Amino acid sequence: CRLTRLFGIEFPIIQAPMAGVQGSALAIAVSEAGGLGSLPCAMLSLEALEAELTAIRSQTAKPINVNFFCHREPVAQAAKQAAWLEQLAPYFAEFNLDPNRTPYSKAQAEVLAKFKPEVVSFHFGLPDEELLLEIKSWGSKVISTATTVEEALWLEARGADAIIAQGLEAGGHRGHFLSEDLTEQLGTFSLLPQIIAAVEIPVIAAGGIVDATTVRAAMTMGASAVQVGTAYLLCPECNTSAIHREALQSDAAQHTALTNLFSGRPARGIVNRFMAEMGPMNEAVPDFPLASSAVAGLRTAAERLGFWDFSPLWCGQNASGCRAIPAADLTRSFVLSLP
Amino acid sequence: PCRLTRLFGIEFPIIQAPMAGVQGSALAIAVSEAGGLGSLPCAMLSLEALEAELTAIRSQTAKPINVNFFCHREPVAQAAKQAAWLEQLAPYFAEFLDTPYSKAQAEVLAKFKPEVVSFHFGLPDEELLLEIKSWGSKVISTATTVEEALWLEARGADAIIAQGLEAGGHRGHFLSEDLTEQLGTFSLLPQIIAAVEIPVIAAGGIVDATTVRAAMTMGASAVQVGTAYLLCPECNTSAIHREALQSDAAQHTALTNLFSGRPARGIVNRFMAEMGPMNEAVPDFPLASSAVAGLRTAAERLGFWDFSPLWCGQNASGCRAIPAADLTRSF
Numbered sequence: 001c002r003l004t005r006l007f008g009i010e011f012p013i014i015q016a017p018m019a020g021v022q023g024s025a026l027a028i029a030v031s032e033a034g035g036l037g038s039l040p041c042a043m044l045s046l047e048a049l050e051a052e053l054t055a056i057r058s059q060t061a062k063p064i065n066v067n068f069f070c071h072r073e074p075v076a077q078a079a080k081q082a083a084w085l086e087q088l089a090p091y092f093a094e095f096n097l098d099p100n101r102t103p104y105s106k107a108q109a110e111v112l113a114k115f116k117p118e119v120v121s122f123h124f125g126l127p128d129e130e131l132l133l134e135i136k137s138w139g140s141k142v143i144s145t146a147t148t149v150e151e152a153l154w155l156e157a158r159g160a161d162a163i164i165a166q167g168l169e170a171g172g173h174r175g176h177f178l179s180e181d182l183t184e185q186l187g188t189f190s191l192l193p194q195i196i197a198a199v200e201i202p203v204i205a206a207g208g209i210v211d212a213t214t215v216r217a218a219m220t221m222g223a224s225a226v227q228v229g230t231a232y233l234l235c236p237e238c239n240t241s242a243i244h245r246e247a248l249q250s251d252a253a254q255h256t257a258l259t260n261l262f263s264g265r266p267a268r269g270i271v272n273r274f275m276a277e278m279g280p281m282n283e284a285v286p287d288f289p290l291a292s293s294a295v296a297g298l299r300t301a302a303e304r305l306g307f308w309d310f311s312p313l314w315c316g317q318n319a320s321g322c323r324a325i326p327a328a329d330l331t332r333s334f335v336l337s338l339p
Numbered sequence: 340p341c342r343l344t345r346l347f348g349i350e351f352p353i354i355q356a357p358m359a360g361v362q363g364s365a366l367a368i369a370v371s372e373a374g375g376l377g378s379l380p381c382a383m384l385s386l387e388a389l390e391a392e393l394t395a396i397r398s399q400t401a402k403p404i405n406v407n408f409f410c411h412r413e414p415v416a417q418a419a420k421q422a423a424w425l426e427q428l429a430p431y432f433a434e435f436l437d438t439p440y441s442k443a444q445a446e447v448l449a450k451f452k453p454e455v456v457s458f459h460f461g462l463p464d465e466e467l468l469l470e471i472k473s474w475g476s477k478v479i480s481t482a483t484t485v486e487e488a489l490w491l492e493a494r495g496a497d498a499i500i501a502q503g504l505e506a507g508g509h510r511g512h513f514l515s516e517d518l519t520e521q522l523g524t525f526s527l528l529p530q531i532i533a534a535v536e537i538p539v540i541a542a543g544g545i546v547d548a549t550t551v552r553a554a555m556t557m558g559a560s561a562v563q564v565g566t567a568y569l570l571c572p573e574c575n576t577s578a579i580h581r582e583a584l585q586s587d588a589a590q591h592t593a594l595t596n597l598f599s600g601r602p603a604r605g606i607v608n609r610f611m612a613e614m615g616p617m618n619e620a621v622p623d624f625p626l627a628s629s630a631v632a633g634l635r636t637a638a639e640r641l642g643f644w645d646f647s648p649l650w651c652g653q654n655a656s657g658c659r660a661i662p663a664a665d666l667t668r669s670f
């Protein structure tokens with residue numbers, strides 16, 4: 001296959017970079033198993049970043065994927081922020097709380113340059129051409145997420161080596177960047193074959209790929225690989241919180257929705273009180289990534305009391321594939337139905 | 340893969356989707372003759388035309404046919420909602436102006452005893468359902484969620500149509516108004532198959548050989564295909580619907596209640612963009628039609644799809660201008 005050769009990996013599974021639930025130990029296990037392991041870097045300081053890459057490199061020399069956000073920083077909006085804070089006042093009262101990141105840059109480049117990742121993935125489009133040329137000159141393949149056909153064509157045109165097609169079924173943030181209109185986005189079943197028809201480069205399927213059968217359906221459609229997120233979230237290598245783990249296993253896990261309430265940007269998570277009462281979508285939330293600061297305390301407080309009411313419970317529309325077995329074992333689950 | 344071909348008495352595991360007001364006996368015949376299951380949509384039909392269309396089908400094939408009804412509950416009286424809504428459309432007016440399945444339908448159906456009877460928006464009463472089973476006829480219905488699937492199986496459905504969000508036309512939900520409970524085919528299909536014992540038909544974005552293959556891979560017993568039949572000459576799709584389907588506008592669709600009162604997937608036009616696509620002010624199901632019925636005749640006459648219900652799935656690329664029989668086999 002085209003991506004196994006291009007990436008130098010055995011199996012056409014990519015473990016989805018999932019910021020906040022996961023680091024080196026899951027990336028190591030999946031790359032050692034023969035797929036592509038992924039380090040989410042969106043929330044890492046430069047110190048954490050270098051540490052975590054050093055930890056990866058001293059347990060495997062197999063390929064890995066380091067992931068970054070390259071969104072536009074929002075624009076000052078202290079008042080929009082203050083108005084949102086005012087709206088949450090009732091929760092602050094209830095929980096007795098006193099209310100009292102950062103796109104890929106040259107700074108992250110300098111650290112990456114020491115390690116030279118086999119792949120560099122981006123969410124929310126691509127960085128500037130210079131940053132991109134710097135990356136390519138490490139030997140790194142560059143991939144990014146498309147949620148429409150137009151986005152896929154934009155990525156090809158700007159030199160992406162592969163496109164991640166994420167259907168609406170996907171957990172975590174929508175990686176859209178040409179349009180704010182969510183009705184332009186498609187489910188996996190329709191996005192995948194339409195992106196493959198439009199581009200010449202390889203296409204990775206993301207959104208609802210949770211098991212052998214679904215991996216098979218994806219490849220049948222002409223995907224060169226699959227990116228799998230939600231179905232690793234119960235693996236011991238994952239740092240998924242007890243309360244997030246509990247939600248995934250409950251029958252609430254089946255009902256998810258797109259919400260901007262936690263971050264400023266549409267993301268899919270298990271439906272909770274905060275989303276039901278204030279959303280799921282809300283036009284008053286500040287631009288990404290400002291909104292996190294306003295719920296950080298509530299989340300902490302409500303989790304401490306064992307409520308998942310104010311948590312970002314990122315999860316796709318098929319939770320049925322999550323299993324508490326080693327991620328290497330699980331990565332092999334996924335490839336049984338392939339030739 | 341064969342549980343349904345056996346069960347329905349058909350050659351191929353392809354069901355042509357019943358599509359009200361776009362499609363009648365000519366398409367059902369052509370697909371049922373071709374070895375798939377052809378469908379007559381009866382939601383929008385008087386008893387006269389119900390009987391005429393069934394008579395027409397039986398006079399041309401003896402092969403199995405599917406007949407489709409709505410069994411939505413009828414809406415409470417709401418003339419003040421209706422009057423208000425008309426008020427909002429006033430600037431448009433200026434720009435140019437100013438039934439569920441029942442014993443009735445059953446009496447006509449009993450003359451023909453059709454091989455399958457399909458329902459949108461749940462199931463009818465126990466009594467009407469037993470009546471249909473006594474003809475030897477198979478009853479199927481749409482689920483948009485796993486709970487809906489299980490509820491249909493427990494009340495005696497012979498198979499489940501799982502319609503993913505990609506599907507064209509009305510959403511067939513009946514347990515929750517919450518659209519966020521619903522699912523794209525890729526996730527709905529496998530979770531319904533895991534949940535139920537009876538066969539599962541896949542609906543929403545099945546448009547070609549590859550997608551059919553991909554749905555069967557996941558363990559569908561059969562596929563239901565609507566959008567991709569719409570350019571077939573046997574289909575009575577309107578000249579401007581045809582034009583919309585072949586333009587780049589087709590690629591963009593959205594769920595909208597503006598034409599009927601219920602959420603249906605159609606190509607985004609001016610009315611949807613300006614007034615919607617979703618608007619809490621539009622009267623309940625079946626009532627909203629009369630509000631825009633005239634604006635469409637008006638608008639379509641001068642060549643505009645600005646006020647048409649241009650219903651279409653999220654994959655329009657398998658539409659082909661060839662006979663329905665060819666297309667059915669190409670799947």
Ligand SMILES: Cc1cc2nc3c(=O)[nH]c(=O)nc-3n(C[C@H](O)[C@H](O)[C@H](O)COP(=O)(O)O)c2cc1C
Pocket residue numbers: 016017018019021040041042067122123166169170171172173206207208209227228229230231314315316317318
């Ligand atoms: C908890 C969680 C965290 C995620 N974090 C990221 C991230 O940091 N960067 C990124 O590009 N994508 C992220 N994703 C998106 C995945 O790359 C992928 O699109 C998605 O998980 C696919 O759908 P699935 O969850 O059904 O496997 C995340 C998804 C989840 C569920």
Ligand SMILES: Cc1cc2nc3c(=O)[nH]c(=O)nc-3n(C[C@H](O)[C@H](O)[C@H](O)COP(=O)(O)O)c2cc1C
Pocket residue numbers: 356357358359361380381382407458459502505506507508509542543544545563564565566567650651652653654
């Ligand atoms: C123009 C059009 C009309 C439809 N009419 C009906 C109908 O009368 N009754 C019904 O139960 N389903 C109806 N559907 C829904 C189909 O039965 C099916 O759920 C859907 O078309 C499958 O998705 P696809 O359009 O991607 O093939 C219609 C769909 C379209 C596009």
